[PDB]
Amino acid sequence: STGSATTTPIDSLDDAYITPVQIGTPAQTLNLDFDTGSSDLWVFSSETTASEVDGQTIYTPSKSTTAKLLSGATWSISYGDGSSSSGDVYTDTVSVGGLTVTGQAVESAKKVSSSFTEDSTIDGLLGLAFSTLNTVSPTQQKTFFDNAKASLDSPVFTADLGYHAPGTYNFGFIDTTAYTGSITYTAVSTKQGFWEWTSTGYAVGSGTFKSTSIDGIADTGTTLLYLPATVVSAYWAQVSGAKSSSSVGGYVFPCSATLPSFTFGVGSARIVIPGDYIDFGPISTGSSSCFGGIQSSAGIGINIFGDVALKAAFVVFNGATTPTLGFASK
Secondary structure, eight states: OOEEEEEEESSTTOOOEEEEEEETTTTEEEEEEEETTOOOEEEOBTTSOGGGOSSOOOBOGGGOTTOEEEEEEEEEEEOTTSOEEEEEEEEEEEEETTEEEEEEEEEEEEEEOHHHHHOTTOOEEEEOSOGGGOOOBSSOOOOHHHHHGGGSSSSEEEEEOOSSSOEEEEESOOOTTSSSSOOEEEEOBOTTSSOEEEEEEEEETTSOOEEEEEEEEEOTTOOSEEEOHHHHHHHHTTSTTOEEETTTTEEEEETTOOOOOEEEEETTEEEEEOGGGGEEEESSTTOSEEEESEEEOTTTSSEEEOHHHHTTSEEEEEOSSSOEEEEEOO
């Protein structure tokens, strides 16, 4: 089997991407944030504290003839940005782009933190990291991909995120028309439960490439590119007037600037992030100070190849017995 679904930016800045997912019978379609940095499929629901729902579409398990309460199971997750959610668990039928999994754990939120409430466009998350990170207790549950894998034509999914435009998540096949040149594959460590890999270096604008190992994660659920402070300083030093602002929470730059590109290495290959991808717009409405899309990972504890990086590439998440990651230009 295969599946193919369009993923759409939630706003004009590509702050996140949403992908429609069918849950239950008859189908209830929710727009979920596909997140290769976590491993829980959780949704706003009829069980979510009412004051914490503000415009989201909810899953109502009582209206699904295939929903079954997973007795005694609870979940609770905290994300790298300080947000969180928790609740109980159903199994139900879940389909993405024509690919159907029966008996998928659908984690129903009883509580969500303010950032989730405040984002009316995101109805929940669909985790695509390794199932070892799944938070369901006392019996850990599998991700949608893990459940689908054996049925797929090939045990892979691909992320093709757009810049200020829709893109595509495919399951079970590699669309050879969706990228240019070749796909370069690179090793993955699953030791932390992530799609963790080592970039071979970077360049800033038209500058020379610096060969240096940068361990980090391919994370579709993180908006920005978080890299070591040395790398980030080298980038922003090429933008007149750019500075790190403790009050704002990272590097900002004059909105009048033209940003340089940023290149990262994948083996001997190179992925170029155009400068415009690194612009996240005014820090507040009407400001001439703009927020940067490349930020320091210092104090995160891990480097994160988030959407800023991934959207410059066609990315293969290869879930073979020994997983790997593939990157192509597009």
